[PDB]
PQR file of N, CA, C, O and H, with PARSE charges and radii, in Angstrom:
ATOM      1  N   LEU A   1       0.893  -1.209   0.076 -0.4000 1.5000
ATOM      2  CA  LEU A   1      -0.020  -0.015  -0.118 -0.0000 2.0000
ATOM      3  C   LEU A   1       0.812   1.263   0.093  0.5500 1.7000
ATOM      4  O   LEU A   1       1.427   1.544   1.122 -0.5500 1.4000
ATOM      5  N   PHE A   2       0.741   1.999  -1.040 -0.4000 1.5000
ATOM      6  CA  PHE A   2       1.712   3.330  -1.159 -0.0000 2.0000
ATOM      7  C   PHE A   2       1.111   4.388  -0.193  0.5500 1.7000
ATOM      8  O   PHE A   2      -0.080   4.325   0.113 -0.5500 1.4000
ATOM      9  H   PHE A   2       0.242   1.771  -1.876  0.4000 1.0000
ATOM     10  N   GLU A   3       1.904   5.331   0.275 -0.4000 1.5000
ATOM     11  CA  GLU A   3       1.396   6.414   1.101 -0.0000 2.0000
ATOM     12  C   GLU A   3       0.298   7.266   0.286  0.5500 1.7000
ATOM     13  O   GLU A   3       0.394   7.460  -0.926 -0.5500 1.4000
ATOM     14  H   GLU A   3       2.872   5.382   0.026  0.4000 1.0000
ATOM     15  N   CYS A   4      -0.781   7.765   1.103 -0.4000 1.5000
ATOM     16  CA  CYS A   4      -1.808   8.500   0.446 -0.0000 2.0000
ATOM     17  C   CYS A   4      -1.262   9.955   0.225  0.5500 1.7000
ATOM     18  O   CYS A   4      -0.761  10.558   1.174 -0.5500 1.4000
ATOM     19  H   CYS A   4      -0.858   7.607   2.087  0.4000 1.0000
ATOM     20  N   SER A   5      -1.350  10.507  -0.982 -0.4000 1.5000
ATOM     21  CA  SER A   5      -0.889  12.008  -1.130 -0.0000 2.0000
ATOM     22  C   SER A   5      -2.154  12.871  -1.007  0.5500 1.7000
ATOM     23  O   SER A   5      -2.056  13.969  -0.459 -0.5500 1.4000
ATOM     24  H   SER A   5      -1.757  10.017  -1.754  0.4000 1.0000
ATOM     25  N   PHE A   6      -3.353  12.438  -1.488 -0.4000 1.5000
ATOM     26  CA  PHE A   6      -4.496  13.285  -1.409 -0.0000 2.0000
ATOM     27  C   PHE A   6      -5.273  13.088  -0.305  0.5500 1.7000
ATOM     28  O   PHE A   6      -6.359  13.662  -0.234 -0.5500 1.4000
ATOM     29  H   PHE A   6      -3.433  11.546  -1.933  0.4000 1.0000
ATOM     30  N   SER A   7      -4.805  12.204   0.770 -0.4000 1.5000
ATOM     31  CA  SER A   7      -5.639  11.908   2.003 -0.0000 2.0000
ATOM     32  C   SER A   7      -4.678  11.804   3.176  0.5500 1.7000
ATOM     33  O   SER A   7      -3.803  10.939   3.200 -0.5500 1.4000
ATOM     34  H   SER A   7      -3.922  11.738   0.712  0.4000 1.0000
ATOM     35  N   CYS A   8      -4.849  12.703   4.162 -0.4000 1.5000
ATOM     36  CA  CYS A   8      -4.000  12.497   5.457 -0.0000 2.0000
ATOM     37  C   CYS A   8      -4.767  11.999   6.567  0.5500 1.7000
ATOM     38  O   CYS A   8      -4.231  11.322   7.445 -0.5500 1.4000
ATOM     39  H   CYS A   8      -5.560  13.406   4.143  0.4000 1.0000
ATOM     40  N   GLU A   9      -6.085  12.315   6.584 -0.4000 1.5000
ATOM     41  CA  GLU A   9      -6.940  11.907   7.810 -0.0000 2.0000
ATOM     42  C   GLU A   9      -7.375  10.445   7.640  0.5500 1.7000
ATOM     43  O   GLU A   9      -7.181   9.627   8.538 -0.5500 1.4000
ATOM     44  H   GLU A   9      -6.521  12.864   5.872  0.4000 1.0000
ATOM     45  N   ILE A  10      -8.024  10.094   6.361 -0.4000 1.5000
ATOM     46  CA  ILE A  10      -8.438   8.725   6.260 -0.0000 2.0000
ATOM     47  C   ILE A  10      -7.498   8.143   5.223  0.5500 1.7000
ATOM     48  O   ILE A  10      -6.788   8.872   4.530 -0.5500 1.4000
ATOM     49  H   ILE A  10      -8.181  10.759   5.632  0.4000 1.0000
ATOM     50  N   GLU A  11      -7.502   6.697   5.116 -0.4000 1.5000
ATOM     51  CA  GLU A  11      -6.686   6.006   4.184 -0.0000 2.0000
ATOM     52  C   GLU A  11      -7.376   5.671   2.920  0.5500 1.7000
ATOM     53  O   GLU A  11      -7.282   4.566   2.384 -0.5500 1.4000
ATOM     54  H   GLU A  11      -8.079   6.105   5.679  0.4000 1.0000
ATOM     55  N   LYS A  12      -8.090   6.682   2.448 -0.4000 1.5000
ATOM     56  CA  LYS A  12      -8.834   6.533   1.059 -0.0000 2.0000
ATOM     57  C   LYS A  12      -8.609   7.692   0.146  0.5500 1.7000
ATOM     58  O   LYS A  12      -9.111   8.780   0.429 -0.5500 1.4000
ATOM     59  H   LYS A  12      -8.167   7.579   2.883  0.4000 1.0000
ATOM     60  N   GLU A  13      -7.934   7.545  -0.860 -0.4000 1.5000
ATOM     61  CA  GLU A  13      -7.614   8.526  -1.761 -0.0000 2.0000
ATOM     62  C   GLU A  13      -8.876   8.903  -2.777  0.5500 1.7000
ATOM     63  O   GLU A  13      -9.159  10.054  -3.111 -0.5500 1.4000
ATOM     64  H   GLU A  13      -7.526   6.662  -1.089  0.4000 1.0000
ATOM     65  N   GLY A  14      -9.505   7.825  -3.160 -0.4000 1.5000
ATOM     66  CA  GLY A  14     -10.721   8.000  -4.123 -0.0000 2.0000
ATOM     67  C   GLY A  14     -10.855   6.683  -5.098  0.5500 1.7000
ATOM     68  O   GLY A  14     -11.936   6.116  -5.260 -0.5500 1.4000
ATOM     69  H   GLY A  14      -9.276   6.890  -2.889  0.4000 1.0000
ATOM     70  N   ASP A  15      -9.795   6.315  -5.645 -0.4000 1.5000
ATOM     71  CA  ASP A  15      -9.857   5.114  -6.539 -0.0000 2.0000
ATOM     72  C   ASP A  15      -9.345   3.903  -5.800  0.5500 1.7000
ATOM     73  O   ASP A  15      -9.973   2.848  -5.896 -0.5500 1.4000
ATOM     74  H   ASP A  15      -8.917   6.775  -5.513  0.4000 1.0000
ATOM     75  N   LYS A  16      -8.136   3.985  -4.993 -0.4000 1.5000
ATOM     76  CA  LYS A  16      -7.737   2.776  -4.343 -0.0000 2.0000
ATOM     77  C   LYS A  16      -7.359   3.045  -2.867  0.5500 1.7000
ATOM     78  O   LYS A  16      -7.262   4.218  -2.508 -0.5500 1.4000
ATOM     79  H   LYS A  16      -7.626   4.841  -4.915  0.4000 1.0000
ATOM     80  N   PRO A  17      -7.163   2.158  -2.087 -0.5600 1.5000
ATOM     81  CA  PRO A  17      -6.887   2.251  -0.617  0.2800 2.0000
ATOM     82  C   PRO A  17      -5.389   2.816  -0.360  0.5500 1.7000
ATOM     83  O   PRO A  17      -4.556   2.635  -1.248 -0.5500 1.4000
ATOM     84  N   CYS A  18      -5.089   3.374   0.619 -0.4000 1.5000
ATOM     85  CA  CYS A  18      -3.607   3.723   0.861 -0.0000 2.0000
ATOM     86  C   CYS A  18      -3.281   3.872   2.335  0.5500 1.7000
ATOM     87  O   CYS A  18      -4.168   3.632   3.154 -0.5500 1.4000
ATOM     88  H   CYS A  18      -5.766   3.520   1.340  0.4000 1.0000
ATOM     89  N   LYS A  19      -2.099   4.245   2.725 -0.4000 1.5000
ATOM     90  CA  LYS A  19      -1.645   4.249   3.996 -0.0000 2.0000
ATOM     91  C   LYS A  19      -1.809   5.724   4.577  0.5500 1.7000
ATOM     92  O   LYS A  19      -2.314   6.576   3.846 -0.5500 1.4000
ATOM     93  H   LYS A  19      -1.378   4.440   2.060  0.4000 1.0000
ATOM     94  N   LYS A  20      -1.434   6.029   5.763 -0.4000 1.5000
ATOM     95  CA  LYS A  20      -1.623   7.382   6.364 -0.0000 2.0000
ATOM     96  C   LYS A  20      -0.345   8.053   6.086  0.5500 1.7000
ATOM     97  O   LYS A  20       0.710   7.537   6.454 -0.5500 1.4000
ATOM     98  H   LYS A  20      -1.024   5.337   6.357  0.4000 1.0000
ATOM     99  N   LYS A  21      -0.382   9.345   5.362 -0.4000 1.5000
ATOM    100  CA  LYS A  21       0.874  10.061   5.257 -0.0000 2.0000
ATOM    101  C   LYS A  21       1.150  11.079   6.401  0.5500 1.7000
ATOM    102  O   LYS A  21       0.267  11.757   6.925 -0.5500 1.4000
ATOM    103  H   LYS A  21      -1.240   9.764   5.063  0.4000 1.0000
ATOM    104  N   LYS A  22       2.492  11.116   6.739 -0.4000 1.5000
ATOM    105  CA  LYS A  22       2.898  12.104   7.780 -0.0000 2.0000
ATOM    106  C   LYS A  22       3.150  13.412   7.225  0.5500 1.7000
ATOM    107  O   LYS A  22       4.206  13.555   6.608 -0.5500 1.4000
ATOM    108  H   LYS A  22       3.210  10.565   6.313  0.4000 1.0000
ATOM    109  N   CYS A  23       2.327  14.431   7.342 -0.4000 1.5000
ATOM    110  CA  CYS A  23       2.675  15.789   6.813 -0.0000 2.0000
ATOM    111  C   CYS A  23       3.623  16.459   7.672  0.5500 1.7000
ATOM    112  O   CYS A  23       3.955  15.878   8.705 -0.5500 1.4000
ATOM    113  H   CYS A  23       1.469  14.314   7.843  0.4000 1.0000
ATOM    114  N   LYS A  24       4.181  17.760   7.364 -0.4000 1.5000
ATOM    115  CA  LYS A  24       5.248  18.398   7.966 -0.0000 2.0000
ATOM    116  C   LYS A  24       4.798  18.698   9.363  0.5500 1.7000
ATOM    117  O   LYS A  24       3.600  18.637   9.637 -0.5500 1.4000
ATOM    118  H   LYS A  24       3.911  18.232   6.524  0.4000 1.0000
ATOM    119  N   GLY A  25       5.717  19.028  10.283 -0.4000 1.5000
ATOM    120  CA  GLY A  25       5.294  19.519  11.738 -0.0000 2.0000
ATOM    121  C   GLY A  25       4.618  20.806  11.737  0.5500 1.7000
ATOM    122  O   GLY A  25       3.791  21.063  12.613 -0.5500 1.4000
ATOM    123  H   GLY A  25       6.691  19.079  10.061  0.4000 1.0000
ATOM    124  N   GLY A  26       4.922  21.668  10.778 -0.4000 1.5000
ATOM    125  CA  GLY A  26       4.316  23.090  10.824 -0.0000 2.0000
ATOM    126  C   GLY A  26       2.999  22.986   9.725  0.5500 1.7000
ATOM    127  O   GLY A  26       2.509  23.971   9.172 -0.5500 1.4000
ATOM    128  H   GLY A  26       5.594  21.459  10.067  0.4000 1.0000
ATOM    129  N   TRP A  27       2.612  21.791   9.564 -0.4000 1.5000
ATOM    130  CA  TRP A  27       1.467  21.747   8.538 -0.0000 2.0000
ATOM    131  C   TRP A  27       0.312  21.104   9.206  0.5500 1.7000
ATOM    132  O   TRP A  27       0.555  20.227  10.035 -0.5500 1.4000
ATOM    133  H   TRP A  27       3.011  20.992  10.014  0.4000 1.0000
ATOM    134  N   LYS A  28      -0.940  21.436   8.944 -0.4000 1.5000
ATOM    135  CA  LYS A  28      -2.095  20.747   9.595 -0.0000 2.0000
ATOM    136  C   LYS A  28      -2.950  19.867   8.609  0.5500 1.7000
ATOM    137  O   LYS A  28      -3.329  20.356   7.545 -0.5500 1.4000
ATOM    138  H   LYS A  28      -1.138  22.148   8.270  0.4000 1.0000
ATOM    139  N   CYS A  29      -3.221  18.718   8.919 -0.4000 1.5000
ATOM    140  CA  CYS A  29      -4.070  17.844   8.038 -0.0000 2.0000
ATOM    141  C   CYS A  29      -5.563  18.059   8.053  0.5500 1.7000
ATOM    142  O   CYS A  29      -6.123  17.954   9.144 -0.5500 1.4000
ATOM    143  H   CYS A  29      -2.913  18.321   9.783  0.4000 1.0000
ATOM    144  N   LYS A  30      -6.259  18.338   7.019 -0.4000 1.5000
ATOM    145  CA  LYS A  30      -7.640  18.555   7.217 -0.0000 2.0000
ATOM    146  C   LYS A  30      -8.533  17.284   6.854  0.5500 1.7000
ATOM    147  O   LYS A  30      -8.150  16.158   7.171 -0.5500 1.4000
ATOM    148  H   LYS A  30      -5.804  18.424   6.132  0.4000 1.0000
ATOM    149  N   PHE A  31      -9.616  17.474   6.247 -0.4000 1.5000
ATOM    150  CA  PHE A  31     -10.423  16.292   5.806 -0.0000 2.0000
ATOM    151  C   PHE A  31      -9.572  15.406   4.882  0.5500 1.7000
ATOM    152  O   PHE A  31      -9.250  14.273   5.240 -0.5500 1.4000
ATOM    153  H   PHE A  31      -9.927  18.389   5.990  0.4000 1.0000
ATOM    154  N   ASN A  32      -9.222  15.895   3.740 -0.4000 1.5000
ATOM    155  CA  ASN A  32      -8.585  15.204   2.676 -0.0000 2.0000
ATOM    156  C   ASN A  32      -7.442  16.197   2.043  0.5500 1.7000
ATOM    157  O   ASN A  32      -7.134  16.063   0.858 -0.5500 1.4000
ATOM    158  H   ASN A  32      -9.484  16.815   3.449  0.4000 1.0000
ATOM    159  N   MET A  33      -6.887  17.091   2.778 -0.4000 1.5000
ATOM    160  CA  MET A  33      -5.916  17.931   2.200 -0.0000 2.0000
ATOM    161  C   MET A  33      -5.004  18.631   3.274  0.5500 1.7000
ATOM    162  O   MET A  33      -5.491  19.303   4.184 -0.5500 1.4000
ATOM    163  H   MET A  33      -7.137  17.200   3.740  0.4000 1.0000
ATOM    164  N   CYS A  34      -3.716  18.444   3.121 -0.4000 1.5000
ATOM    165  CA  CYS A  34      -2.848  18.995   4.205 -0.0000 2.0000
ATOM    166  C   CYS A  34      -2.550  20.641   3.973  0.5500 1.7000
ATOM    167  O   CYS A  34      -2.188  21.057   2.873 -0.5500 1.4000
ATOM    168  H   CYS A  34      -3.321  17.898   2.382  0.4000 1.0000
ATOM    169  N   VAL A  35      -2.716  21.399   4.965 -0.4000 1.5000
ATOM    170  CA  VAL A  35      -2.396  22.887   4.711 -0.0000 2.0000
ATOM    171  C   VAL A  35      -1.536  23.476   5.776  0.5500 1.7000
ATOM    172  O   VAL A  35      -1.640  22.998   6.906 -0.5500 1.4000
ATOM    173  H   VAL A  35      -3.010  21.062   5.859  0.4000 1.0000
ATOM    174  N   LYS A  36      -0.749  24.395   5.576 -0.4000 1.5000
ATOM    175  CA  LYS A  36       0.058  25.082   6.724 -0.0000 2.0000
ATOM    176  C   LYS A  36      -0.970  25.562   7.772  0.5500 1.7000
ATOM    177  O   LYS A  36      -2.051  26.055   7.449 -0.5500 1.4000
ATOM    178  H   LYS A  36      -0.664  24.784   4.658  0.4000 1.0000
ATOM    179  N   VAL A  37      -0.561  25.385   9.064 -0.4000 1.5000
ATOM    180  CA  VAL A  37      -1.344  25.851  10.190 -0.0000 2.0000
ATOM    181  C   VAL A  37      -1.218  27.253  10.409  0.5500 1.7000
ATOM    182  O   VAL A  37      -1.828  27.791  11.333 -0.5500 1.4000
ATOM    183  H   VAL A  37       0.317  24.985   9.327  0.4000 1.0000
TER
END
């Protein structure tokens, strides 16, 4: 299972399943998109 790029909260990108991706420390993960906090 490759890391999910379009999903940080859930392990679902849209077409296939994926793993949880660890965003940067100064970044905040939202529903399905990581943005700077």
